């Protein structure tokens, strides 16, 4: 139990000089002996000669004579690149010597300025000094938002440092495959960049280093001989940077600054991390009908959730105000419920997998069969409405039969004549919109995932009441047929479906303007 | 199932629901899945508390293969809960071949009939079943 | 250099061994379940082992106490003799429990490693960087503080920039520009092309053209976007596009001629 | 359309990048002819103000541009359809 650890085990590394040199010379002087010179061209034999040059006092000189093919290792830029990459955390200073141009000379120091501060105890490191390390580690201009320092002991022994960058980098969503955010060190010598095995794809915004004292290394010391040990590292890392967020979530003003910078990455991991999505869902926040100025946690919805609610009501669409005004939302607002607004394309992919939260199911406000708890004095109105409108909805299908699967009276409308909702299974209007717009997805096989449109009408609203009077006189009257396509088009348009034939609607509203201007017969 | 069983991994009550069918020619085993159970009688009885042996899953595969061949529940008209529990547990029952489709050729319908006969048997045939169905294609 | 300690490790949640005909996310939770149940049956085996050990250890000890009592004032051999047969049977049973005690620790060694046998936690600390201070200072005192510190920097720039309108000085410059993250530079180089407009030599003003066109384009993009001019970066200067060549000389003429 | 549908939008930068619109009118068309005659008879007519927006929205749709608020287009179309049905 002496307190040194060194990089010595294999015994072959010195002969790597002959990758680059044609001849090698070593002058050494050890205490308790005289100075000798050792020389070889890797030719199967070497010579040892007592040296009589300048006094060294103590030390070694390794003189490589280079191959012409390798001349670039003499240059300042390549010595800088290599020592920064591989060796910047050697304890002892590393120094370089060159010329100036007044005219003559320089020496240069500190190719390894930065100390490997993860060796120091976390009580003895200031929040300034962590930030000073981070800048250099990442080559950034600005400090970290938060940091985690931990260690593991037993058979797999390591130190670690984790940083949460303050603003996402411009390239974060992109796939340049450098995977350099996490660095693996053994005994303070660099082994590898993470190569997507130390941290999951969606957590790749984390900058840090892992340092362990021993690991089954490959003969070139670039790789691990037992690959599974990288996964046992990743299960520790992933678990702890999750804990980091929670602590960060007690600091509300920093949390919103984190969340606005990285929110999608959480959601991207709901879609992919089948184990931790319980934990990750508690980190989500959204806008809602209540507190429309600031996001609220999904647990807070439950806290406020009325004793009669059985589910969490949500709606997805192109913006906050477009969602807040949408025709599906009026009844749930009137009845004092809370609607969650989900206004990003990525919300569809996390909502596919987040089927429930805290034992409560998530229900879409834009799907058929929407249940909102019933009053018996409402239930009787619904029954007599269903009875009186039966002819209108039957005749409306009899005209519109190609386009809708089903037609019925609406339960979620106030202040609009009609709306269109999708079947329970398949893409709602917004997910159709997004899937149609993908650059590299084959939509030909959509047939099993496309939902079917069920049309619902407001029994109270004047236009639908008038339409039962209009349909009453003549079931075959084209003038009521012509509404039930125009109203359908107008309802589609509000619900997020594209017109597959937009010119027809346009020409209708231009024929409407020929009414509004008194020129409908061109006279 | 073949790739699975090679790892001594057993889930009881393999069924037609816990399997998922996706876009493309794409069918894939899951875990989500009184209630509609399908069982070898060894599992039904109180007798041995770990009825874990692979043969149970093979015979339960034989049941879901007959669902694939019938497109309707086994025992759907024959029984209520008392008869379907008791007679199967006593080893004294079979679902009807009336619902098994005759648009199947002799090769696979006979192999499915052997998947009924496996109730009588202790044979963990999965790689050889796989060979048999594969080659009969 | 033996690595045999690392030979066998079990990892649930491994993507390198998912079968294509199985739902991957189902298989991980299902493979995790098997690990924990295997461990619990082996923990139960340690309880039944210890039950067997305790019974033998106690019943041999009770037999030994009665043997020692029966050796005091000997006479009536039946007890003392039968206790040799009881000690023999209890020892024969104990030797089976010793074989099971060896089999226990041998099986604990022979089972593969996993995520919570390989490891136990050391120290752990989590810190949040409570924000840097924000401030404001007069246009005159900041422009003086920049200029008085920049009398060496902008000399070092016209010299290191000194090869015209191509890649070379970017290798030297972009690291030094970390000092210039604070710069507001738009004034100085242009006040310098303004300094001797009556008399100045073409090379040094053509380097102001180059510095100012590249930096001023960046500053226009930094107004046009959220970005810091160190974070947005001269990777974009690789572009062959006509917008560098034609427009550069057009503005060189405009900015030289007007003053 | 495509950029707005991407999962990994990077939405702030695209919110700058989106380019602006120019409206084109057909000089020979009965609508433009009428609207001009109306606007020449009274430049400040609330009817031509209400027209120019209704006309404009229709051109967003035919050009591939989504509305800011599809609901208010539909309310304005229903303010017209109540004439169409004699309701109010
Ligand atoms: N400058 C030096 N001063 C003292 N001893 C040295 C020096 N350079 C090499 N050695 C000696 O030469 C031996 C061989 O070194 P070499 O790099 O080839 O193997 P190693 O360091 O032991 O293992 P590895 O291949 O992993 O680096 C060392 O173990 C050490 O005894």
Numbering used by the authors:
A (entry chain B): 120 to 220, 273 to 694
B (entry chain D): 456 to 488, 507 to 610
C (entry chain C): 2 to 260
D (entry chain A): 604 to 691
Sentences from the paper on this structure:
The cochaperone phosphatase PP5 dephosphorylates CRaf and Cdc37 in an Hsp90-dependent manner.
Our cryo-EM structure of PP5 in complex with Hsp90:Cdc37:CRaf reveals how Hsp90 both activates PP5 and scaffolds its association with the bound CRaf to dephosphorylate phosphorylation sites neighboring the kinase domain. Beyond these features within the kinase complex, two new densities were visible. A complete atomic model constructed using the consensus and composite maps clearly revealed a PP5 conformation quite distinct from that found in the autoinhibited crystal structure. Instead of sitting atop the PP5 catalytic domain active site, the PP5 TPR domain was disassociated from its catalytic domain and interacted with both Hsp90CTDs. Here, the PP5F148 and PP5I152 residues which were solvent exposed and disordered in the PP5 autoinhibited state, were stabilized by Hsp90 hydrophobic residues (Hsp90A: L638, L654, L657 and Hsp90B: I680, I684, M683, L686). The PP5 linker connecting the catalytic domain to the α7 helix has conserved acidic residues (PP5D155 and PP5E156) that lie in close proximity to Hsp90R679 and Hsp90R682, stabilizing the α7 helix within the Hsp90 amphipathic groove. Surprisingly, the PP5 catalytic domain was not located near the readily dephosphorylated CRafpS338 but was instead located on the opposite side of the Hsp90 dimer, with the PP5 active site facing the CRaf C-lobe. The PP5 TPR and catalytic domains are separately bound to Hsp90, liberating the PP5 active site for activity and placing the phosphatase domain near its substrates.
